[PDB]
Amino acid sequence: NAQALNTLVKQLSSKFGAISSVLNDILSRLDPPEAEVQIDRLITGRLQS
Amino acid sequence: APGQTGNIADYNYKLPDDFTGCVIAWNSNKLDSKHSGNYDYWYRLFRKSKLKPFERDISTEIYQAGCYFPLQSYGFRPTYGVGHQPYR
Amino acid sequence: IYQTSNFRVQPTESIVRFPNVTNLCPFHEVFNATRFASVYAWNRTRISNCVADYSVLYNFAPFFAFKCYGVSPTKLNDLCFTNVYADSFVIKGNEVSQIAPGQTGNIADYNYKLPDDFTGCVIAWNSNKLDSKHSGNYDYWYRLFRKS
Amino acid sequence: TQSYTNSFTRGVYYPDKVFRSSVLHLTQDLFLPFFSNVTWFHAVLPFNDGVYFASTEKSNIIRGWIFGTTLDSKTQSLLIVNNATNVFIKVCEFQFCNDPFLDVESESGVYSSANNCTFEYVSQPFLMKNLREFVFKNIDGYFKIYSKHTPIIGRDFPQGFSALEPLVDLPIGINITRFQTLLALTAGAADYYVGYLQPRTFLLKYNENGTITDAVDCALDPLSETKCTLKSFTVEKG
Amino acid sequence: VVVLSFELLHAPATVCGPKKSTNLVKNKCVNFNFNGLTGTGVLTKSNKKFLPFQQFGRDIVDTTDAVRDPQTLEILDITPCSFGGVSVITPGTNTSNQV
Numbered sequence: 370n371a372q373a374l375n376t377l378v379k380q381l382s383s384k385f386g387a388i389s390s391v392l393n394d395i396l397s398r399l400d401p402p403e404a405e406v407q408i409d410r411l412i413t414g415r416l417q418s
Numbered sequence: 419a420p421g422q423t424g425n426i427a428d429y430n431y432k433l434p435d436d437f438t439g440c441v442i443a444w445n446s447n448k449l450d451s452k453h454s455g456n457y458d459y460w461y462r463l464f465r466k467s468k469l470k471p472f473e474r475d476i477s478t479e480i481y482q483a484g485c486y487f488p489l490q491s492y493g494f495r496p497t498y499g500v501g502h503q504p505y506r
Numbered sequence: 507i508y509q510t511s512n513f514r515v516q517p518t519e520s521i522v523r524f525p526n527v528t529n530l531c532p533f534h535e536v537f538n539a540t541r542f543a544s545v546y547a548w549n550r551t552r553i554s555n556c557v558a559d560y561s562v563l564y565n566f567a568p569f570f571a572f573k574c575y576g577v578s579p580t581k582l583n584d585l586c587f588t589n590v591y592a593d594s595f596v597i598k599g600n601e602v603s604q605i606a607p608g609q610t611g612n613i614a615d616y617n618y619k620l621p622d623d624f625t626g627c628v629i630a631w632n633s634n635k636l637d638s639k640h641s642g643n644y645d646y647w648y649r650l651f652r653k654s
Numbered sequence: 655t656q657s658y659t660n661s662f663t664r665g666v667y668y669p670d671k672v673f674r675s676s677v678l679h680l681t682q683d684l685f686l687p688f689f690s691n692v693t694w695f696h697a698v699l700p701f702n703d704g705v706y707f708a709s710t711e712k713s714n715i716i717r718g719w720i721f722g723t724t725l726d727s728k729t730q731s732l733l734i735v736n737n738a739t740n741v742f743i744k745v746c747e748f749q750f751c752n753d754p755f756l757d758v759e760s761e762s763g764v765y766s767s768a769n770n771c772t773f774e775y776v777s778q779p780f781l782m783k784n785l786r787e788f789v790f791k792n793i794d795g796y797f798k799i800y801s802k803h804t805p806i807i808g809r810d811f812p813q814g815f816s817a818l819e820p821l822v823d824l825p826i827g828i829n830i831t832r833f834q835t836l837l838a839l840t841a842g843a844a845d846y847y848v849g850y851l852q853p854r855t856f857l858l859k860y861n862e863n864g865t866i867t868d869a870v871d872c873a874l875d876p877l878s879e880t881k882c883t884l885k886s887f888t889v890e891k892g
Numbered sequence: 893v894v895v896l897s898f899e900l901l902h903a904p905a906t907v908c909g910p911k912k913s914t915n916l917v918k919n920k921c922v923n924f925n926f927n928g929l930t931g932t933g934v935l936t937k938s939n940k941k942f943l944p945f946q947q948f949g950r951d952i953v954d955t956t957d958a959v960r961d962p963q964t965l966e967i968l969d970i971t972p973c974s975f976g977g978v979s980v981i982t983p984g985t986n987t988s989n990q991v
């Protein structure tokens with residue numbers, strides 16, 4: 370039960386195919402429609418975890 | 419176009435990101451351009467800041483630095499294409 | 507017993523910390539300097555890394571012209587372009603329709619040619635009082651004719 | 655003399671600027687593999703992807719570097735010198751094509767056609783029974799240099815562990831391919847080594863005070879590979 | 893007349909504009925931006941030792957838990973602001989309405 374929680378938390382620092390792994394970091398330095406598809410990759414990856 | 423920002427992209431005509439219509443170009447350079455400049459009607463170059471989508475402002479010359487009207491002429495030509503097209 | 511939602515403690519304010527502001531740009535060198543090079547032999551003013559505060563620019567010798575062809579005056583201090591290409595010279599006031607993309611004429615194809623794809627700020631003001639004293643500097647030369 | 659010697663367990667530097675305590679972090683970057691060949695020069699070389707200088711003597715061994723591409727003409731070369739008061743990390747090039755002088759008094763005898771100098775960075779002098787090490791890694795126009803100031807106790811390689819700390823990083827933006835060494839700080843000897851860098855995976859160990867104290871090469875022998883998989887320094891029977 | 897051209901190149905930018913700063917607060921849930929690092933939490937005085945080249949600390953699960961103030965070199969701790977679930981205890985609504 371300890372390993373599963375540690376693995377779950379460490380999945381928050383994975384790019385999953387986007388520019389970065391921080392929500393507001395890509396929110397600022399990116400085009401608002403361009404940033405829409407980047408958030409999609411992070412959401413789909415974190416749902417699968 | 420939705421999203422992209424800079425100069426008149428959001429200073430005057432802020433197109434919402436949820437746009438659904440279709441953009442059409444009508445170029446008749448000879449008809450809607452004077453030989454020395456369409457000074458009759460002017461564009462707001464340097465206003466205060468941006469504005470929310472579908473917002474119209476008509477007050478002018480009230481703002482001044484802390485410059486007058488920011489209408490920096492047209493200088494159009496009926497034959498010039500780059501920088502002078504009417505592009506309605 | 508049912509579970510409905512979650513509770514959170516909202517932040518009360520916002521805070522920002524950044525290092526000491528040092529290494530001001532060479533813009534102070536042109537300050538307290540009421541003379542520089544000519545228009546054809548324009549003085550090079552390449553700028554290395556430094557803090558790009560520009561408020562002092564608007565204070566010393568209030569500029570008649572403040573418009574920026576490439577950028578906006580509001581979007582002035584936010585930018586962090588790689589370097590600076592600053593060119594300065596002395597021009598006639600009646601030649602106002604000569605420093606811009608286009609309007610090729612006496613100063614364009616004979617003296618230094620202003621690039622059409624300008625991406626900076628156009629600053630101009632009448633500095634006759636600060637420069638042209640009673641004696642005058644009529645010995646200064648500028649091209650009115652050429653062959654290239 | 656182009657002799658060779660075992661590199662042992664040397665060439666570990668701090669990979670980033672992150673504090674850690676009592677953790678075993680498994681990184682993946684450029685490193686010098688354990689037990690490799692070292693060309694023990696005594697009396698011109700490709701840059702590859704980094705070097706490991708180890709010139710020690712006792713007090714005075716090395717006093718210059720070049721780190722250029724063409725080493726002549728007007729191509730930018732990141733000339734690096736040092737003395738008792740300051741270093742000169744400057745983008746300014748001579749013509750070279752000659753052996754610099756080995757005086758024990760000024761820059762004469764090394765420079766011939768000193769042209770424009772673009773960058774003129776100056777900082778604390780490099781110098782702090784002395785061992786001096788170096789790593790010259792460049793990526794995305796970032797010249798990163800590391801250092802260490804352990805005293806020399808053995809005339810051979812002082813077997814042990816060391817961790818190079820960052821010294822300075824510069825946004826140069828140029829690419830280099832060759833380099834030269836300047837020495838003598840007159841019959842004598844000048845001990846001097848050099849290695850090379852390869853991509854590798856390492857398992858570093860941090861104590862609770864944030865100082866690297868050990869490492870394991872993950873592609874050396876079957877035992878070392880097992881430790882990286884388990885992320886531990888002890889393997890039980892199995 | 894002076895014209896300054898804002899050229900740019902793939903090499904790292906050199907001339908950035910002026911940067912501002914604010915005060916510092918402790919034991920209060922507040923948003924922070926420490927030299928380009930963003931986050932929220934409560935900042936308190938730390939008791940850890942930093943080598944004089946590192947900036948911030950990370951825990952085992954790679955989450956920031958310590959920072960260094962760029963104005964004055966001092967180490968600060970970061971703790972997230974409190975959160976949790978909420979439950980409602982009720983009897984039969986056919987009987988009463990208290991909760």
Ligand SMILES: *[C@@H]1O[C@H](CO)[C@@H](O[C@@H]2O[C@H](CO)[C@@H](O)[C@H](O)[C@H]2NC(C)=O)[C@H](O)[C@H]1NC(C)=O
Binds near residue numbers: 745747769771773
């Ligand atoms: C020193 O100044 C010279 C010019 O006097 C620089 O040479 C120019 O460098 C720029 C950018 O590096 C090039 O775009 C030009 O084509 C170069 N011109 C010539 C004639 O070489 C030089 O880069 C400066 N710095 C050094 C270290 O020499």
Ligand SMILES: *[C@@H]1O[C@H](CO)[C@@H](O)[C@H](O)[C@H]1NC(C)=O
Binds near residue numbers: 525526963964
């Ligand atoms: C930055 O300014 C503050 C002002 O009080 C000063 O205390 C501090 O020492 C300065 N930073 C450095 C690195 O000296």
Ligand SMILES: *[C@@H]1O[C@H](CO)[C@@H](O)[C@H](O)[C@H]1NC(C)=O
Binds near residue numbers: 538
């Ligand atoms: C700055 O300008 C004033 C103008 O009167 C002058 O007195 C002073 O010496 C100048 N300072 C310099 C050039 O450092």
Ligand SMILES: *[C@@H]1O[C@H](CO)[C@@H](O)[C@H](O)[C@H]1NC(C)=O
Binds near residue numbers: 541542544549550
């Ligand atoms: C050009 O600028 C430099 C740097 O400020 C200055 O030393 C030099 O006197 C200037 N030349 C002229 C002709 O103004």
Ligand SMILES: *[C@@H]1O[C@H](CO)[C@@H](O)[C@H](O)[C@H]1NC(C)=O
Binds near residue numbers: 690691
């Ligand atoms: C180091 O020596 C040579 C390098 O010339 C190399 O071929 C060899 O494998 C290395 N190891 C030993 C033990 O010689």
Ligand SMILES: *[C@@H]1O[C@H](CO)[C@@H](O)[C@H](O)[C@H]1NC(C)=O
Binds near residue numbers: 739740
């Ligand atoms: C080291 O070199 C610098 C070069 O600027 C020189 O000024 C200094 O005197 C030198 N050190 C000694 C001890 O001479």
Ligand SMILES: *[C@@H]1O[C@H](CO)[C@@H](O)[C@H](O)[C@H]1NC(C)=O
Binds near residue numbers: 861862863941
């Ligand atoms: C870490 O630092 C503390 C305080 O300086 C010291 O007591 C302790 O021994 C250090 N740990 C080491 C050196 O492993």
